[PDB]
Amino acid sequence: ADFDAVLKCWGPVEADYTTIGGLVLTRLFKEHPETQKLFPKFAGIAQADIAGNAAVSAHGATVLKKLGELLKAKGSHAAILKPLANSHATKHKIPINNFKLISEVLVKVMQEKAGLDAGGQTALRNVMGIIIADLEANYKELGFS
Numbered sequence: 833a834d835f836d837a838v839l840k841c842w843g844p845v846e847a848d849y850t851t852i853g854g855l856v857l858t859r860l861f862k863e864h865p866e867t868q869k870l871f872p873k874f875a876g877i878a879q880a881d882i883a884g885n886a887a888v889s890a891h892g893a894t895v896l897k898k899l900g901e902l903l904k905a906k907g908s909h910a911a912i913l914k915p916l917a918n919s920h921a922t923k924h925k926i927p928i929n930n931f932k933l934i935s936e937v938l939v940k941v942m943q944e945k946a947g948l949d950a951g952g953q954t955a956l957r958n959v960m961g962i963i964i965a966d967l968e969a970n971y972k973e974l975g976f977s
């Protein structure tokens with residue numbers, strides 16, 4: 833049910849993955865500035881220059897498309913989430929807590945741009961919790977506790 837509650841507001845996100853993706857990463861870097869250093873192409877870019885950066889927006893679109901692909905499944909995790917855990921633990925070297933940060937940013941952006949109501953906000957937090965727990969289990973399998 834919580835996947836359905838999020839999908840019923842995904843239309844504005846999928847309609848403009850680049851614009852919404854840029855909103856998400858811009859807001860992540862503003863509200864959680866330590867996350868920006870984890871993206872070495874973007875680390876050091878002054879905040880004023882982030883909203884208009886096409887590479888940032890394109891990266892955000894990639895994130896959102898992947899999340900759409902993980903909603904649109906409702907728990908077919910594996911062939912999709914295991915590679916994501918593998919790359920984020922071992923290539924990008926992202927501490928797991930950062931996923932909670934981007935998930936709260938996404939909740940805020942969907943509240944503002946996608947009509948996600950209070951119950952929808954809770955549903956999305958639930959869904960992101962499922963995703964993050966699976967990512968963490970895979971991090972642990974790789975030796976990243």
Ligand code: HEM
Pocket residue numbers: 867870871872873894895896898899915916919920924926930931934963
């Ligand atoms: C559920 C949330 C997230 C999703 C769906 C996601 C998705 C992706 C995807 C699909 C890619 C490109 C393919 C790959 O390397 O795996 C990627 C790359 C990357 N992600 Fe994420 N990501 C998420 C969260 C994060 C967070 C929280 C951070 C850091 C705070 C992060 C940092 C990176 C970095 C540094 C790259 C490589 C950028 C480059 O190669 O140009 N990701 N992510």
